[PDB]
Design an enzyme around this catalytic site. Structure first.
Site, PDB file in Angstrom:
ATOM      1  N   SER A   1       1.283   2.863   0.060  1.00  0.00           N
ATOM      2  CA  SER A   1       1.150   2.272   0.358  1.00  0.00           C
ATOM      3  C   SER A   1       2.092   1.090   0.284  1.00  0.00           C
ATOM      4  CB  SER A   1       0.077   1.121  -0.600  1.00  0.00           C
ATOM      5  OG  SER A   1      -1.118   2.513  -0.481  1.00  0.00           O
ATOM      6  N   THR A   2       3.190   0.661   0.654  1.00  0.00           N
ATOM      7  CA  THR A   2       4.303  -0.580   0.214  1.00  0.00           C
ATOM      8  C   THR A   2       4.537  -0.554   2.092  1.00  0.00           C
ATOM      9  OG1 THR A   2       6.112   0.813   0.529  1.00  0.00           O
ATOM     10  CG2 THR A   2       4.995   0.086  -1.185  1.00  0.00           C
TER      11      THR A   2
END
Ligand SMILES: *C(=O)[C@@H](NC(=O)Cc1ccccc1)[C@@H]1N[C@@H](C(=O)O)C(C)(C)S1
Length: 640
Positions: free
Chosen positions: A384-385
């Site tokens: 999700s970064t």
């Protein structure tokens, strides 16, 4: 004039055999022993070349400027120039002579001493004296030692001073209970095949204080390679091992008594660290009186190498991983200086380069967590970064309105019915989701919908501006990051998964810190840098400055908002902009899925530091954000 055609082939066939190391085949194409022919027999020439060329490690004999004539009925003189590589460098500009002989129908060579070296004559000998070069040091950005050669306290036993019976068994139990050694291993070294009743058999390396010595225990000082941080930088630095005979056969300029880098920077920078061997190679008289010097130069020690690594940050980053599988990368994002390249679990490079057992070495290779892997150079799915980059692309091409609020109901979503059973999944059931809300809760459904709305062409247009497929100018073996397997997703499902950092994405931690540096340079990507003196390289206009000023304040809320996935970091009381991630990895056999925790964080006020930490195959409740407080405090204090 077809006689000179066979003569040039005879000389060419002879040099190849010498170059190929086959001295016997070279000795067979010589003439018989006579004053008008060869000066030695075939078996005598074999021992002549093998002893002389072998002692100097001659390799790569190549000739040029060949000239073959015909002086008499069967006396065709030949001459050329040649060069070769020895233990003391290249020996160039060698003038060779000699004659040929073509009785019967085959052209044989009239061998003479001057066919070994130009000025050999009769029973001339060859001597080679060498002075070994000291290996250079590896130092951090402040001169702290990371890999140097120094004096060590070596523990060892001598079987005679141990005693006879009973008294000898008691000291074996006493030496084992004083140096943290196995009692069954003291006799494992005493009873080896190479041991004699009075020899000094090595045991363990004392890395600090010297305890009391039982009956039959001497500590001898021997110099060797030493790594201060130990396992905290074993993957990056590497280790050196004893040089083998095949190492010399591949590169004669080494040292049979020296050490060669076997992994890490010790191997990547082996040439600059080992230096060059000194000494001289000379020809002597029949009695050993020096006649002609062939090669000679002073011993030049290896060059020191200064890294951007902070030795204190490297140790803190490694220790924060608690011995679990993972890695941490810390940079100064405005310059790209790699402050820390930690990887865990790790191996003992001091034990590796000194004395290590086949048992401890097998434990390293058969360890499932694989301590030998440089995880900072291993490609992973970013998780999700990666939403930061998908969002910045959506802001650059105007696809994403930061204030537009999507309405998402539930924890599952799909584009239409053609997706079947697959659905994008989120963890928080927030009904009203905009860009700021999506980054705080890490909403995959928002990211998936904005990615599909963007389309593949617009998505890849923003992705290609990064470093996908590029080979970074770093002395670290790594594969380039990739968007997918092929140049086209050919699947709306795979397009969405790539949006929130899953799919076929493969970006290693170092490449992630490079791609994420745009948020600390107003959209300019700054390539990472490991060598201190190397010039900073950047890449302008990767994302728009408007997108940076939009996302970075939202990344502050990932830490500061009460429901932010990095809210535990607000306890630090320092300006933080972060983004968390937990990528899911499918399992081969019907087994529970593996999860990888991720954390990206940097200082949004001064851009002094930037870090990317991860845990591979995380345990439950474990995460990278959980372990980042200590490294963030140091980087914020010392790098502004
Ligand atoms: C990004 O990595 C997202 N992860 C997932 O959708 C997979 C997942 C993994 C474990 C449990 C549930 C879902 C989101 N970002 C992470 C994170 O930021 O740590 C969340 C766990 C919030 S889901």
């Amino acid at each position: 004039t077809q006689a000179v055609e066979a003569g040039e082939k005879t000389v060419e066939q002879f040099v190849q055999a010498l170059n190929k190391g086959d001295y016997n085949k070279a000795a067979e194409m010589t003439s018989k022993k006579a004053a008008n022919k060869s000066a030695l027999s075939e078996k005598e020439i074999l021992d002549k070349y093998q002893n002389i060329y072998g002692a100097a490690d001659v390799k790569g004999l190549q000739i040029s400027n060949l000239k073959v004539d015909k002086k008499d009925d069967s006396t065709y003189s030949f001459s050329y120039k040649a060069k070769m590589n020895t233990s003391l460098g290249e020996l160039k500009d060698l003038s060779y002579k000699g004659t040929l002989d073509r009785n019967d129908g085959q052209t044989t060579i009239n061998w003479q001493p001057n066919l070994v070296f130009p000025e050999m004559e009769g029973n001339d000998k060859v001597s080679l004296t060498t002075q070994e070069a000291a290996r250079g040091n590896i130092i951090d950005r402040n001169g702290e030692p990371l890999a140097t050669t120094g004096k060590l306290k070596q523990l060892g036993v001598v079987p005679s001073k141990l005693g006879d019976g009973g008294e000898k068994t008691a000291n074996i139990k006493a030496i084992a209970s004083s140096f943290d050694l196995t009692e069954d291993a003291i006799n494992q070294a005493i009873s080896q095949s190479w041991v004699q009743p009075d020899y000094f058999v090595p045991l363990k390396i004392i890395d600090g204080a010297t305890p009391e010595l039982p009956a039959g225990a001497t500590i001898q000082e021997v110099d060797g390679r030493y790594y201060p941080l130990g396992e905290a930088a074993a993957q990056l630095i590497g280790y050196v091992g004893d040089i083998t005979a095949e190492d010399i056969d591949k590169n004669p300029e080494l040292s049979s008594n020296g050490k060669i880098g076997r992994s890490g920077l010790e191997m990547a920078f082996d040439k600059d660290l080992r230096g060059t061997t000194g000494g001289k190679l000379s020809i002597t008289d029949a009695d050993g009186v020096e006649k002609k010097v062939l090669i000679e130069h002073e011993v030049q020690n290896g060059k020191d190498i200064k890294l951007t690594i902070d030795a204190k940050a490297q140790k803190t980053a490694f220790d924060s991983l608690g011995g679990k599988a993972g890695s941490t990368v810390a940079t100064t994002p405005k310059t790209g200086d790699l402050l820390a390249l930690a990887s865990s679990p790790s191996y003992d490079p001091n034990k590796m380069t000194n004395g290590i057992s086949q048992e401890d070495y097998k434990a390293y290779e058969e360890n499932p967590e694989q301590p030998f892997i440089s995880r900072f150079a291993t490609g992973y799915a970013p998780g999700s970064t990666f939403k930061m980059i998908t969002a910045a692309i959506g802001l650059d091409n105007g696809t994403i309105d930061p204030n537009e609020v999507l309405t998402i109901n539930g924890l599952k979503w799909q584009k239409d019915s053609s997706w079947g059973s697959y659905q994008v999944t989120r963890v928080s059931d927030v009904s009203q989701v905009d860009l700021k809300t999506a980054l705080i809760y890490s909403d995959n459904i928002y990211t998936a919908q904005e990615t599909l709305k963007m389309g593949e062409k617009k998505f890849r247009t923003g992705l290609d501006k990064f470093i996908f497929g590029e080979d970074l100018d770093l002395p670290i073996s790594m594969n380039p990051a990739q968007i997918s397997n092929e140049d086209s997703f050919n699947s709306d499902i795979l397009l969405a998964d790539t949006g929130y950092g899953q799919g076929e994405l493969l970006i290693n931690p170092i490449q992630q810190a490079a791609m994420y540096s745009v948020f600390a340079n107003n959209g300019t990507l700054v390539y990472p840098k490991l060598i201190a003196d190397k010039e900073t390289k950047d890449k302008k206009n990767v994302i728009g400055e408007t997108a940076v000023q939009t996302i970075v304040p939202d990344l502050r809320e990932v830490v500061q908002d009460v429901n932010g996935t990095a809210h535990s970091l607000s306890a630090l009381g320092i300006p933080l902009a972060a983004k968390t991630g937990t990528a899911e990895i499918p399992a081969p056999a019907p087994a529970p899925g593996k999860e990888n925790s991720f954390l990206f964080a940097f200082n949004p006020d001064n851009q002094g530091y930037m870090m990317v930490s991860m845990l591979e195959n995380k345990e439950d409740d474990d995460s990278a954000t959980k372990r980042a407080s200590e490294l963030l405090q140091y980087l914020n204090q010392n790098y502004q």
